[PDB]
Design a protein around this ligand. Structure first.
Ligand SMILES: COCC(CCO[C@H]1CC[C@@]2(C)C(=CC[C@H]3[C@@H]4C[C@@H]5O[C@]6(CC[C@@H](C)CO6)[C@@H](C)[C@@H]5[C@@]4(C)CC[C@@H]32)C1)COC
Ligand SMILES: COCC(CCO[C@H]1CC[C@@]2(C)C(=CC[C@H]3[C@@H]4C[C@@H]5O[C@]6(CC[C@@H](C)CO6)[C@@H](C)[C@@H]5[C@@]4(C)CC[C@@H]32)C1)COC
Ligand SMILES: CCCCCCCCCC(=O)OC[C@H](COP(=O)([O-])OC[C@H](N)C(=O)O)OC(=O)CCCCCCCCC
Ligand SMILES: CC(C)CCC[C@@H](C)[C@H]1CC[C@H]2[C@@H]3CC=C4C[C@@H](OC(=O)CCC(=O)O)CC[C@]4(C)[C@H]3CC[C@]12C
Ligand SMILES: COCc1nn2c(CN3C[C@@H](CC(F)(F)Cl)CC3=O)c(C(F)(F)F)nc2s1
Ligand SMILES: CCC(=O)OC[C@H](COP(=O)(O)OCC[N+](C)(C)C)OC(=O)CC
Ligand SMILES: *[C@@H]1O[C@H](CO)[C@@H](O)[C@H](O)[C@H]1NC(C)=O
Ligand SMILES: *[C@@H]1O[C@H](CO)[C@@H](O)[C@H](O)[C@H]1NC(C)=O
Ligand SMILES: *[C@@H]1O[C@H](CO)[C@@H](O)[C@H](O)[C@H]1NC(C)=O
Length: 574
């Protein structure tokens, strides 16, 4: 029966073992996670393209990928469940192709709506791709080390995070390119960035063609000749490199059992949430939602908090110039953080000036000349402009809030605010994301090195405990750099939890409801990511415990309720 089939397959993979083929597959399928990390970045951190490039302090957006996450929630449901009926390589290839097409295609649109509609489908693809990776590499390993050799794969998610962060603060260090983007090469670097991205997926898609399909899938459908060749192929591949190329595959025999393919996928996914696998899934869903919500919320809450603290340190410097009587001033030095409520400007000359955070609430502008005057967040509210000659200044006929002119004549247009030393905030959030992924190296290393030396049920509990402790420690370190250290710690501590959970999820599910489950759970993780990136980011200037307590409580409830899951070490793959 199926038990004997699984026993025979485990003996087979123990005969073959590891070598020149498992490493190749780990490097290939890794590139399909690399692209998932790149997309997670493009969706959570490279979203601010709506931030007004002409204004600073502008708040981030919630559309670039808040809707692309819903894309990864529909691709995990369909493409992740369509694998157990069509294959784990066929649908993985389709997913990666959708992503690489509608990603490299988004580098040509002339607007944000088309860019959004393209990144949506790219996310669909990659989110359908992720689960199939773990349900496809989990069929070439051996029960002895299914946890270690399956946890290293997370090294590629981190790798895509680094790739995207670096190629972003190196290509798109600015914001405000989602403003009816044109088709040219003027400040059009997001195109070169989107092209640099999709390279991991574009390399996996072509490297996937050279890879065989999962035998167990070809062994459950009811055919052998299409599988016994793969097994022979893997044995030869791992023996040629090793010192025994003369060993021949000993096993010879083995035992085995439109508008309709989606009905089968539904009847399959429904068997995962009701009947058998209802208790193991109703808990894995909880743990997954908790993990993902917490992680995404907290990794979006850190850099935003860095920027909030930077602003607050910049805000205290606001030097209210309620004074007046400025006479004969050839002013040419930058004028930052000033609000002249009641000022009397007479015969003044702001020449070669840069206005940043300069407000005027009630000014009798008797006379003043303006030249090469640039503005970022300037505003003249209830002013009184008597005789001012604005020449070669910024185009800011809108900053004049409710006040008219008498002797004015404007001869300026087509100027940019700074396009420098202000978007360093986006450079900073990209660098924070980089340093946060770069800290997952020790976490994933120790995870893969210990996931087999000890259980997978206690690693989850320990990692979630330490993440909750880090969270509760964040309530004290309200600094601008300590937040980065706490991010590094929380990340390097959380990675192990996701590894253990991927292991426990490749177990607990037969080979027919493995990718389906994985896909539903990835969709739940993406919904939790939506909730996190929409909740935590909405508490950067309102509260500091609400999101922290949410994340800590979610992690504790996902780590202590996960202990209700069994130990899956000696259990066969099935
Ligand atoms: C101040 O602004 C500077 C900027 C120009 C700087 O450009 C450089 C920035 C570093 C960057 C992006 C560059 C090329 C190779 C990139 C590396 C390739 C490696 O690939 C990786 C990931 C994939 C792995 C397989 C191998 O290692 C990374 C570790 C390594 C990498 C991604 C780190 C970042 C590197 C270009 C101009 O800004 C407007
Ligand atoms: C195979 O049989 C052994 C197995 C247990 C596995 O133990 C491993 C731990 C030590 C060691 C030497 C082994 C392989 C990968 C090695 C890692 C590769 C990564 O490369 C680096 C280099 C720097 C970065 C560029 C990437 O990461 C290091 C951080 C990481 C590394 C060098 C740390 C040391 C690891 C074996 C169970 O069998 C009894
Ligand atoms: C090809 C490729 O990507 O590199 C493969 C290379 C070899 O992996 P390896 O170093 O683990 O040797 C495999 C050996 N047969 C075993 O059973 O462990 O792994 C590398 O270290 C490179
Ligand atoms: C629940 C009990 C009975 C079992 C203990 C399980 C351990 C295997 C867990 C618990 C704490 C976990 C550690 C929590 C913190 C880290 C730090 C982490 O390092 C980092 O990447 C962040 C450090 C930094 O850059 O600041 C590496 C993984 C590690 C050792 C974790 C490895 C797995 C550990 C030891
Ligand atoms: C969300 O979708 C469902 C899955 N995501 N996911 C990932 C990707 N991770 C792991 C975490 C990276 C951290 F270090 F910050 Cl904790 C957050 C994240 O996005 C992996 C991994 F390969 F990393 F092990 N396994 C699965 S299942
Ligand atoms: C991949 C190495 C790489 O990342 O190269 C970095 C450069 C920097 O971006 P850029 O300034 O060329 O962006 C285009 C700006 N524009 C359109 C106004 C000229 O990006 C590249 O040129 C990579 C080809
Ligand atoms: C500003 O003007 C003063 C004289 O009014 C001059 O000494 C100084 O060099 C000028 N600085 C700049 C940056 O133009
Ligand atoms: C501007 O402020 C002054 C000071 O209170 C007030 O007298 C005047 O009516 C205000 N004008 C407008 C247009 O608000
Ligand atoms: C300002 O406008 C008034 C009204 O037209 C005019 O009499 C006066 O000459 C103008 N002065 C300047 C400096 O433009």
């Amino acid at each position: 029966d199926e038990e004997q089939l699984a026993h025979q397959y485990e003996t087979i993979m123990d005969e073959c073992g590891h070598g020149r083929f498992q490493w190749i597959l780990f490097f290939v399928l890794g590139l399909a996670l690399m692209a998932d990390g790149v997309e997670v970045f493009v969706v959570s951190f490279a979203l601010p393209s709506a931030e007004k490039d002409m204004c600073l302090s502008s708040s981030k957006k919630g559309m670039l990928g808040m809707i692309v996450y819903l894309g990864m929630m529909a691709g995990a449901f369909i493409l992740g469940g369509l694998a157990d009926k069509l294959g784990r390589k066929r649908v993985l290839s389709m997913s990666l192709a959708v992503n690489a097409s509608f990603a490299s295609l988004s580098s040509f649109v002339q607007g944000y709506g088309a860019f959004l509609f393209c990144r949506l489908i790219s996310g669909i693809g990659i989110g359908g791709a992720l689960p199939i990776v773990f349900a496809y590499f989990s069929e070439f390993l051996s029960r002895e080390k299914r946890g270690e050799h399956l946890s290293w794969l997370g090294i590629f998610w981190m790798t895509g995070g680094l790739y995207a962060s670096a190629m972003a603060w190196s290509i798109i260090p600015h914001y405000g390119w989602g403003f009816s983007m044109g088709t040219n090469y003027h400040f059009h670097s997001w195109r070169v960035f989107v092209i640099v991205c999709a390279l991991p997926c574009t390399v996996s898609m072509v490297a996937l063609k050279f890879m065989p399909e999962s035998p167990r899938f070809l062994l459950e459908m009811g055919k052998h000749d299409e599988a016994w060749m793969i097994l022979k192929q893997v044995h030869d591949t791992n023996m040629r490199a090793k010192g025994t190329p003369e060993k021949v595959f000993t096993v010879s025999n083995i035992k085995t059992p439109f508008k309709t393919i989606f009905k089968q996928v539904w009847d399959n996914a429904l068997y995962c949430v009701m009947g058998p696998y209802r208790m193991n899934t109703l808990i894995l869903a909880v743990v997954w939602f908790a993990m993902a919500f917490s992680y995404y919320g907290l990794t979006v809450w850190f850099p935003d908090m860095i920027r909030y603290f930077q602003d607050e340190e910049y805000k205290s410097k606001m030097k209210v110039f309620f004074g007046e009587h400025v006479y004969g001033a050839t002013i040419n030095f930058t004028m930052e953080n000033q609000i002249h409520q009641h000022g009397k400007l007479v015969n003044d000359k702001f020449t070669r000036m840069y206005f940043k955070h300069v407000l005027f609430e009630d000014t009798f502008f008797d006379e003043c000349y303006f030249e090469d005057v640039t503005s970022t967040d300037t505003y003249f509210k209830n002013c009184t402009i008597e005789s001012t000659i604005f020449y070669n200044t910024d185009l800011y006929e809108h900053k004049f809030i409710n006040c008219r002119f008498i002797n004015s004549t404007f001869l300026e247009q087509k100027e940019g605010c700074h396009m420098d030393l202000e978007q360093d905030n986006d450079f900073l959030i990209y660098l924070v994301s980089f340093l946060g992924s770069l800290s997952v190296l020790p976490g994933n290393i120790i995870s893969a090195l210990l996931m087999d030396r000890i259980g997978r049920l206690k690693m989850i509990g320990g990692s979630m405990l330490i993440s909750a402790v880090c969270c509760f420690f964040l309530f004290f370190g309200n600094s601008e750099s300590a937040m980065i250290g706490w991010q590094c710690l929380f990340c390097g501590t959380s990675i192990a939890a996701w590894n253990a959970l991927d292991v426990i999820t490749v177990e607990l599910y037969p080979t027919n409801q493995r990718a389906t489950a994985f896909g539903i759970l990835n969709g739940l993780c993406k919904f939790g990511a939506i909730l996190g990136n929409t909740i935590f980011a909405s508490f950067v200037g309102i509260t500091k415990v609400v999101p922290i307590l949410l994340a800590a409580a979610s992690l504790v409830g996902g780590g202590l309720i996960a202990l209700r899951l069994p130990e899956t070490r000696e259990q066969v793959l099935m």
